[PDB]
From a paper:
Under these genetic constraints, cattle have developed a unique mechanism to accomplish antibody diversity by forming the broadest distribution of CDRH3 lengths and the most frequent occurrence of cysteine residues in CDRH3 loops. Consistent with the five structures solved previously, the 7 new CDRH3 structures also showed a long “stalk” formed by 2 anti-parallel β-strands supporting a compact, globular “knob”, further establishing the stalk-knob configuration as the general structural peculiarity for the ultralong bovine CDRH3s. Each of the knob structures starts with the conserved sequence motif [CP(D/E/A)G(Y/W)], in which the initial cysteine residue forms the first disulfide bond with another cysteine residue in the knob, and the motif forms a type I β turn. The compact globular folds of the knobs are maintained primarily by several disulfide bonds, a feature that is similar to the core of other small disulfide rich proteins or domains such as voltage-gated sodium channel antagonist mu-conopeptide, CnIIIC.
The two antibodies with 4 or 5 cysteines (BOV-5 and BOV-6) both used a cysteine pairing pattern. The knobs of antibody BOV-5 and BOV-6 form one-layered structures without the second layer seen in antibodies BOV-1–BOV-4. BOV-5 and BOV-6 have relatively short CDRH3s, which might be due to deletion mutations in the region encoded by the DH2 segments. DH2 deletion mutations have been observed in bovine ultralong CDRH3s, contributing to diversification of bovine antibody repertoires. Interestingly, deletion mutations in the region encoded by the DH2 segment in BOV-5 and BOV-6 reduce “two-layered” knob structures to “single-layered” ones. In the crystal structures of antibodies BOV-6 and BOV-1, there are 4 and 8 copies of Fab molecules in one asymmetric unit, respectively. However, electron density associated with 4 or 3 knob regions of antibodies BOV-1 or BOV-6 is mostly or totally absent, suggesting that these ultralong CDRH3s are highly flexible. The structural flexibility of the stalks, and the hinge regions between the stalks and knobs, explains the lack of the electron density in some knob regions of these Fabs.
Numbering used by the authors:
A (entry chain B): 2 to 9, 11 to 217
B (entry chain A): 2 to 25, 29 to 73, 76 to 116, 130 to 173, 180 to 231, 238 to 260
Write the structure that this text describes.
């Protein structure tokens, strides 16, 4: 019982993009379709209400329409901040019974690529007092969101005890990811250098920490 | 205008779930919308000024909404693993307009005379949304986090480490909301032990994180300052 929406919709930068909301006569047939925008890290944003009426603070590029049982949302001059999930909704058989759409993910093409920002933190002194050490490597602001991460200890590639999260999309269309190296306290002070080598689109960024010169 | 959602972030299966919504509250109705992770938004229900409550037909027997005219509480009984979702409290506009064609002739109580049936239009749209609230559904066990300050080895980079905790979520606010320009909270990672672990860094050009873990009723404040070098 969910209005049919396209799964993926891709539009070029500065170009037009349409999202159809194929419904029936009980819901979209009733002329009151609403549209909503879902940006990661923010509360849902009401875009259009009552087919064609824009909300407050939504640009003219977001135009709503409907022909019979099908409502469409048109985004003109698409930007990088328009990348989100869009949902259509309307009442059905009652003013307090509404159905949403299956969802449409907008991915805007043509964005420029950006190198990843790598930051590596040593294990805190407070954590070292529990005979435990965790190296936090934070990667942020890289596009596209494909990043390969490898650790090293004095040139030797680490494999064990490494847990890396997937690339989560930030609010500014770019992606972010983290990586954790949980070590024993003896294993932390057992090497000379620890490196978080991050590779992204061939360009490799690396940060290094040295337990001897880190106090 | 603001809107706050309160309630338990953890509920075991086969157990009633009760939430509460307060906002700065009688001009418009109050509605509840939940979103399953990786799924579409789901309309739960609402209650208007007169007290009339509408429910979703697929779950009407399971959930119930009460109101005390400025707190509207949503109660979904007999929760399961499929109820884990982010529950948004919202102020939704509802209006049922019985429409008649050209002629201005309408009537109820079951040219002046007309043989065109009465077709009505239902007005519905969410006016304002809430920040949200994630409610997880699992037996499990509420394991509190241990917060450790983060600093470089010597812009300047600092942060906090929310290590070893379960279940989600955790809200990390720097300086009780005062520090917001330059804060970046990363999503949590799931380690082998079964506990989550996230970080929250703040970048300064040239500091106390307030980590909150609702499942254990935990609010730990950790002061962070760069190394002396």
């Amino acid at each position: 019982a969910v209005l049919n929406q396209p799964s993926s919709v891709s539009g070029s930068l500065g170009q037009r993009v349409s999202i159809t909301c194929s419904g029936s006569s009980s819901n979209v047939g009733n002329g009151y379709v609403s549209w909503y925008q879902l940006i990661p890290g923010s509360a849902p944003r009401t875009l259009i209400y009552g087919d064609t009426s824009r909300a407050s603070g939504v640009p003219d590029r977001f135009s709503g329409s409907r022909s019979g049982n099908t409502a469409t949302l048109t985004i003109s001059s698409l930007q990088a901040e328009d990348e989100a999930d869009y949902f259509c909704a309307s009442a059905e058989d009652s003013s307090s019974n509404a159905v949403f759409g299956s969802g449409t993910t907008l991915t805007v093409l043509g964005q420029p690529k950006s190198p990843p920002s790598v930051t590596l933190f040593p294990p805190s002194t407070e954590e070292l007092n529990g005979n435990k050490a965790t190296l936090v490597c934070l990667i942020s602001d890289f596009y596209p969101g494909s990043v390969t991460v490898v650790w090293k200890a004095d040139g030797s590639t680490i494999t064990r005890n490494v847990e890396t999260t997937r690339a989560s999309k930030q609010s500014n269309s770019k992606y972010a990811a983290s990586s954790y190296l949980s070590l024993t306290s003896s294993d932390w002070k057992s090497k000379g250098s620890y490196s978080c080598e991050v590779t992204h689109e061939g360009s490799t960024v690396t940060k290094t920490v040295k337990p001897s010169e880190c106090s | 205008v603001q809107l706050r959602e309160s309630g338990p972030s953890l509920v075991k299966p086969s157990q009633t779930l009760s939430l509460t919504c307060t906002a700065s509250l009688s001009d418009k109705a109050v509605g509840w919308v939940r979103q399953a992770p990786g799924k579409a938004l789901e309309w739960l229900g609402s209650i208007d000024t007169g007290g009339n409550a509408g429910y979703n037909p697929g779950l009407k027997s399971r959930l119930s909404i009460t109101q005390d005219n400025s707190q509207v509480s949503l109660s979904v009984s007999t929760v399961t693993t499929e109820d884990s979702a982010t529950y948004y409290c919202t102020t939704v506009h509802q209006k049922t307009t019985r429409n008649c064609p050209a002629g201005y002739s309408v009537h109820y109580d079951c040219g002046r005379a007309s043989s065109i049936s009465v077709t009505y239009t239902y007005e519905w749209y969410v006016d304002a949304w809430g920040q949200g609230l994630l409610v997880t559904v699992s037996s499990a066990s509420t394991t509190a986090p241990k917060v450790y300050p983060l600093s470089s080895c010597c812009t300047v980079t600092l942060g906090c480490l929310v290590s070893s905790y379960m279940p989600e979520p955790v809200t990390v606010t720097w300086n009780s909301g005062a520090l917001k320009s330059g804060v970046h909270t990363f999503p949590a990672v799931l380690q082998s032990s079964g506990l989550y672990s996230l970080s929250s860094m703040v970048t300064v050009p040239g500091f106390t994180c307030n980590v909150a873990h609702p499942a254990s009723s935990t609010k730990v404040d950790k002061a962070v300052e760069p190394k002396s070098c």
